[model samples]
Target: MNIFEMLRIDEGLRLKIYKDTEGYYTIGIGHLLTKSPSLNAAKSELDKAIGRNCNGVITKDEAEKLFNQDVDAAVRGILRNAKLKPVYDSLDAVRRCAAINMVFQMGETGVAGFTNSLRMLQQKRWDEAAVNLAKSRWYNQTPNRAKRVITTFRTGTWDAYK
Candidate 1:
């Protein structure tokens, strides 16, 4: 489910649907990290992981706790495999997490193995870009799901607002 649907909230939950200093919503685990990295970033990698805001399907506290556990595990997995340095450097954690989250959602290995495209990104070869980028998308889900993200960013949908 989209983030809003997941976090079942009540009047007292203090759901602040506005941007933080960095300009992202402070709605759930991912939002929390994006908003207040200093408070939670130091706690543990898990505390820094993405989270959910499930309405009542899971209590906020419970969902946050689960977010912490899952994120920490995901971060640890990233850290353990130094090979992911390419991903960490080529893309920000948010994008990396998006890919990872998709992988996690799809139940398969995520962006952890797009070595060729990653290497190309590092070198800045605009011409060979699409093919290499396709490698990451084609590895997993249907071309459309992968295209939804990669293609949009490439075509300027992401920057259109800018």
Candidate 2:
């Protein structure tokens, strides 16, 4: 599967509103509504995106579109992180997608804090990068996804994904 498809599977699609792990109201493939600072503000954005009242019952196309927007934002933010720019650009597609998965789970700032890991990635020290990834609370919380992404970083290939 492509990167987007992989992310879709990771995030899980939901056409209706549901409480997220943090208890925020979310819809459209984990599109958080309550955490946009306010529920109304978030719904307003959806109203513009899908041209509907957005009472959390979004269409499949709308869900995917919203997901695409989020992915765009996520990728942009990852690149915008000054320290990670060169490393992100130097990495292959599979390894980059692994990073993107990490940024998706925890925002750019969260990943940016991984200085040693980022240095390892920049130096192409795949094993050290994987070890650094394992030495995190993130790994403890989301072991499966963490293992998949870390393995991708370690291998520089899609084998873990497959």
Candidate 3:
């Protein structure tokens, strides 16, 4: 499966600047720009991506580049995670992608907190894992995206589409 395509559907590419629902200045498939609390920390990088130092716009090429980088970071972080690596490696392809997608949006630390769900997944307890996911604050915050991911976990299938 093209994880990039799946993530684009969920994150959406906005060429223009927009505040994330959490109020961070995010652009280019949810790339958090200038956000080291100062919120302007990565301002220069954003400028370079747009090539004008202007919040005016982002090119398609640049957007996709950042998107790829951001997604890869998420994927790598999950793979390198000491505590989560075994659970991640034990999953089937479908479930593995689901886990990466969760980490992509939630961050590694965020996903690391799902202890019970992780254990359930490690033991191949599909329904049990999905139930745990469904009760999360993430599920409530973005119910549609969370539902698709949870379905993938339970059924061990790709539930996302472009």
Candidate 4:
């Protein structure tokens, strides 16, 4: 798959805002809870992989590589799931992308909790699906992003956010 497609599948294509997972700040594509490093150490491989200075920030190129590797793994994991195959196959490309985006934000188990939204999409009820998504805690947490996705569902266009 292309890099953009892979990113959509795993990272929600976010460029800003670090995510909080399990009480730790994660940046890039699941780049986990990194403690700020002490500058006294020599440049070790671990430091390189962490891709940051004492400020705990990475360059754009470093972030891209990290996200690329993480998304690749997430794509492979999705392909291995037999149950997801049918669900994935049922939607058109746009809606399929929506499903993948949801999977990226929440893991498979978490996405499964959106039964009403899933059913609305499966039933081809686009507006209701959007409304359902708007009503979700996910939407409350990230309204701008949720609106983007919801608009995609309602319009079947990729650039709803843009």
TM-score of 4: 0.66
Model 4 weakest 10-residue run by lDDT? 37-46
Per-residue lDDT tens digits for candidate 1, residues 29-58, read 433323344433323332333244333133
What is the number of residue pairs that collide in model 4? 0
**lDDT tens digits, residues 12-105, model 3?**
8898777776777788898877555554555665787666776546878888988888888987897788978899899888888788889988
lDDT for each residue of candidate 4 in 1-162, tens digit (9 for 90 to 100): 333553444344333335453344555555543433422222332256665542445566666777667655555655777766666666777766666666666667766667787778777889888888788778887677677767777777767644
Roughly what TM-score does model 3 have, to 2 decimal places? 0.88
What's the count of clashing pairs in each model shown?
8, 0, 2, 0
The 0-to-1 C-alpha lDDT of every candidate, in the order given, reads: 0.43, 0.80, 0.80, 0.61
Clash pairs (backbone) in predicted model 1: 6-53, 6-54, 7-53, 7-54, 7-55, 8-54, 8-55, 46-72
lDDT of 1: 0.43
Candidate 2 total steric clashes: 0
Give the per-residue lDDT digits (tens) of candidate 2, residues 1-162.
567977876778888777677666678776766565576666676677678687647889888888898889889997787887888998988888887887877887778668899888999999988898899988887788789889888987778767
Q: Over the full model, what C-alpha lDDT does candidate 4 score relative to the true structure?
A: 0.61
Cα lDDT, model 3, residue 4: 78
- Whole-structure CA lDDT of model 3: 0.80
